[PDB]
Homo-oligomer: A and B are copies of this chain.
Amino acid sequence: RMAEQQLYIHGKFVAATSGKTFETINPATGEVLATVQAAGREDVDRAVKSAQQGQKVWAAMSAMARSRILRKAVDILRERNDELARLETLDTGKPLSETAAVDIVTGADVLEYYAGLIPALEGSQIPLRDSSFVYTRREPLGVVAGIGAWNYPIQIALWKSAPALAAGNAMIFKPSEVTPLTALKLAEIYREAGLPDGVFNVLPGIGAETGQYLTEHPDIAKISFTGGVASGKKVMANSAASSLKEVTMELGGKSPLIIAEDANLDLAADIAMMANFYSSGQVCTNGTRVFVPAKFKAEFEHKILERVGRIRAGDLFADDTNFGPLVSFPHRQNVLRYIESGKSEGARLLCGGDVLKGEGFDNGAWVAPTVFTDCTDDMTIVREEIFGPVMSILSYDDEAEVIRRANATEYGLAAGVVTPDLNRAHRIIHQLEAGICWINSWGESPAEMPVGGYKHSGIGRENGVMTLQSYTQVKSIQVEMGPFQSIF
């Protein structure tokens, strides 16, 4: 075990006053990684009062002073990339080959990006007439809250905290109870970089208690949430009933990958693989509906199976391991229920469909890489997000058909097309109802690129210049230099 994990409030670790704890499990072994204290209602109020004090100090600094502090945190994150990745691997089950290459690297990339943009955050000036003009300030919201998910814990903490801090706010962050550990490390790193006390506080806890207290607190101006649709609805509802808050939500999806009639099938299979089996399928943007032309289906299926042969499950710290267990045993039970529904509805199982067995697997939350084919639009595994390593392959005949079927979903997060044809690529992409679209690739999410969902996949965006601005609020100021006229 690790030492008991405490709350992080005002630049130090502190015990919760709730009397409550929870355990985070190592999904490779089933053993308790750490006992973690859960923030109660009083702890949340302490954190808000801490955040209000730190935010004022932070906002009073110059823009470049803030930039330098966030840049110092970047420098530390680069220095400690491997240490943090190992902790993320223990907490999440994702292979070290992923966490050491992606999770901290791309989280720190977004922090570095926003650090450089702070001096460029500007309001406007609007002349009305010789005797009057308007100017605007992009002011901090104040205290904002982030609620993270368990698939990319520190990356999510960085993608929410970076624009929030760069915009002059304090953020209170609640990591998922499944994966609370790296967020506490991030808090220490920020303070070491010189972040003022209270500007980034971390409250581990359960969604139903700590998360609810955050969403209900009257002095929190904005909630940013990553997770599933079901929890998103609770968060949105509670934020409205209790105290009005701006809200950002990234909620996953059922993203379609469209393989065109002129696609190279090796390229198409490589993209489909990376869109389904990275992080053991636990990625919001995964292309879990793979639409393949009927004329290519059989050959595509054989290419996918060949690549499934390249998946290497094993020791998560071994260099050649590229597939992990799922994040938790309850999550695995849910994925197995989806797989069983696929079988009972007649989807054709090409590989996988069961847990992994044997030495080194019996005690971990492993699900084999699973591919179904001959899938149809009404199947449960086609309609619902599984968030495991389960690819659904669907045949199609014509371009208008596949666009309709790709869009006939309540989800809207990502989409992609594989085609060498100029007109086909742009023409199809422009008709797809998704916020993140990839042409002849999958998964790259540059700091510069706004990402978020259409329809039930989200509200608002993350990354890009617009997200820095979305963590400010506009104040419009009219200077009236002429004589004021009253009609009374």
Contacts and interface: CB of A to CB of B under 8 A. Distances in A.
Interface of A: 60, 62-64, 67, 71, 97, 109, 112-113, 115-120, 122-137, 218, 221, 229, 232-233, 236-237, 239-241, 243-247, 249, 251, 267, 270-271, 273-274, 277-278, 307-308, 310-311, 322, 410, 419-423, 425-427, 429-430, 434-442, 444, 446-452, 454-461, 464-466, 473-481, 483-488
Contact of A123 (B71, B124, B429, B460): B124
A422 to B, nearest CB: 4
A440 B481 contact: yes
Given A71-B71, A236-B240, A120 B120 contact: yes
B437 A130 contact: no
A448 B480 CA distance: 15
A138 to B, nearest CB: 8
A477 B124 contact: no
Contacts of A116: 67, 115-120
Contacts of A123: 124-127, 135
Contacts of A271: 484, 486
A134 B439 CA distance: 10
A20 to B, nearest CB: 27
Contact of A474 (B423, B430, B448, B452): B452
Contacts of A127: 63, 123, 137
Nearest to A272: B486
Contact of A446 (B128, B270, B410, B441): B128
Q: How many chain copies does the complex carry? A: 4
A464 B483 CA distance: 25
Contacts of A473: 435, 454
Nearest to A481: B423
10 contacts: A120-B465, A123-B124, A123-B127, A243-B455, A310-B488, A422-B422, A422-B439, A439-B479, A439-B480, A454-B473
Of the candidates A422, A452, A457, the one having the most CB atoms from chain B within 10 angstroms of its own CB is: A422
A256 to B, nearest CB: 14
Given A435-B475, A441-B480, 11 more contacts: A63-B448, A116-B119, A124-B125, A125-B137, A135-B135, A136-B449, A232-B244, A437-B478, A439-B478, A449-B478, A454-B473
Contacts of A126: 122-123, 446, 448-449
B240 A244 contact: no
B119 A125 contact: no
B243 A456 contact: yes
A441 B478 contact: yes
A418 to B, nearest CB: 9
A211 to B, nearest CB: 15
A119 to B, nearest CB: 5
Contacts of A452: 474
B125 A478 contact: no
A436 B119 CA distance: 19
A66 to B, nearest CB: 11
A119 B109 CA distance: 11
A359 to B, nearest CB: 23
B439 A477 contact: yes
Contacts of A480: 438-441, 444
A443 to B, nearest CB: 10
A385 to B, nearest CB: 14
